[PDB]
Amino acid sequence: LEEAPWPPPEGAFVGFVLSRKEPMWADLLALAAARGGRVHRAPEPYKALRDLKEARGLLAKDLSVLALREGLGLPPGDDPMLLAYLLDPSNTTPEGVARRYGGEWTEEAGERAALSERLFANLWGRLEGEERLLWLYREVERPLSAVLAHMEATGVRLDVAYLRALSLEVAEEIARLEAEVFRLAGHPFNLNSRDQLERVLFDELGLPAIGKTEKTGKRSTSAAVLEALREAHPIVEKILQYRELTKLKSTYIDPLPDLIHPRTGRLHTRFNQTATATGRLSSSDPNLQNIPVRTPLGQRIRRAFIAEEGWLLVALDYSQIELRVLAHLSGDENLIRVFQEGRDIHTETASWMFGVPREAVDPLMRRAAKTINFGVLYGMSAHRLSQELAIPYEEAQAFIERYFQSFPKVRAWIEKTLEEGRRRGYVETLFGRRRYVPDLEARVKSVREAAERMAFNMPVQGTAADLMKLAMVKLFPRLEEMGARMLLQVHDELVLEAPKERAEAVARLAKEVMEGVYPLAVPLEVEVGIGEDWLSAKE
DNA sequence: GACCACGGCGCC
DNA sequence: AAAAGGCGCCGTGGTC
């Protein structure tokens, strides 16, 4: 390429180098742009940012996030990563995409700029003819990246002093548990070490081993194994409680408070847009899509996520979402009838599980049933079901049989989906998002059958993902106009932040936009709650 | 210090 | 553990 002076022309492709991967924390080391066999390198990267109309290139969102941090409204535009991911969602890294589509991901801004332009040309040409993938790029993914940038740069408030106080309390409980565990073992050991614990449990206490680990074939000490051993020795229960507290303390209570950004006073995750096989987003550094909620200590941690003073959080969550999608994809009359009648599959399974009438099902009962409902849908074995519910094997077998016989077309849809996946080599969502599954043709049954479960799940989980993404795209401009904020997406859930005076109107609006995102053969319902913290905002 | 495979486990 | 699918992070034991 030929060196030309900064600034580049309009529509040029950017390349930039960060001191670290997280845009909210990085120093902008270098910045460059490329167009028309020219490369323009910027003397002063930060000042050079004021010269761009949009971030166009590999990882566009990240530079946009950094620009937003510095008070610059630089929106992300075309990004070759998005094109590659739509062509084949195994395209997840710039290193991989470069190797596959025509260059090398280096550590130099100018080469990265030239690389962005080359890759965009090639990938765009491969997208020609693919009208449905084109529709997803222009109407969903590309504008979505703008929305995600604003979400990352805005972040979410955390009650730091609360978490610190909670730490000290949980530290003391952990000490009680480990001390009791050592007493029962007769000696101390590293309780955090599953190799040491296995020896204690199965060699010293002579407990029966239940299962083996995958790669190394050791005797498993997982929660499920321990659960099976709960009656066998008093140490087991203590170990389960220890596992829960230390998981929560080391993963959330201790690290979160140290991640508060000095400028914003808030927590800033990254919303990774090309990271899953199904079209879901992922969240990292920190992951805020896996904040605890299910156990009492977990709920206490979730409370730490709060609104700015004078504002309220609004949480909206699609009802039974993948079941609704499955009703649309499969066309099962019975399943459609369920939703047109306003019924609840989770609640109904809960009624069976606990042996109570539908009217007498508490939220806890309904929620334990959700894990059962999807486990079965996506292929859980009778054996596992019987062990999870502590019922006889043949009772678990019966539940699974009735489950599919009551929704007769679901199995037909699965069979069609797999058949089509064998011929084409890929499966797709309602909007044409593809996932390649070559192992549908594998000659080893266990491999083929795992491939099959991956394959028929993808259209369902992926269609739900498409709907959520499209809804964020439609919702975002409305919120800006109302002076409200989009903070987090947790798969089928959105968390917003609204001025207290408008929290209610924002809630109503958001609900309507999400339920009407894309009319199906069944209604989409959204549960919405409002509160001063994340826990109270989901009731 | 930084990486890794692994088992394990938090959320959807 | 197990014929659920999809993620990212943690500590240990280990290397470099």
Ligand SMILES: C#Cc1ccc(C#Cc2cn([C@H]3C[C@H](O)[C@@H](COP(=O)(O)OP(=O)(O)OP(=O)(O)O)O3)c(=O)[nH]c2=O)cc1
């Ligand atoms: C307390 C509690 C609690 C919270 C969440 C779950 C869960 C879940 C799962 C969700 N999913 C998919 C299908 C779900 O429809 C989708 C969204 O999860 P989620 O919002 O929790 O459930 P869903 O929408 O079906 O019902 P909802 O309670 O009406 O929201 O993610 C799974 O594939 N497997 C699961 O185990 C289980 C218990």
Ligand SMILES: [Mg+2]
């Ligand atoms: Mg839901």
Ligand SMILES: [Mg+2]
């Ligand atoms: Mg949800």
Ligand SMILES: [Mg+2]
């Ligand atoms: Mg170490």
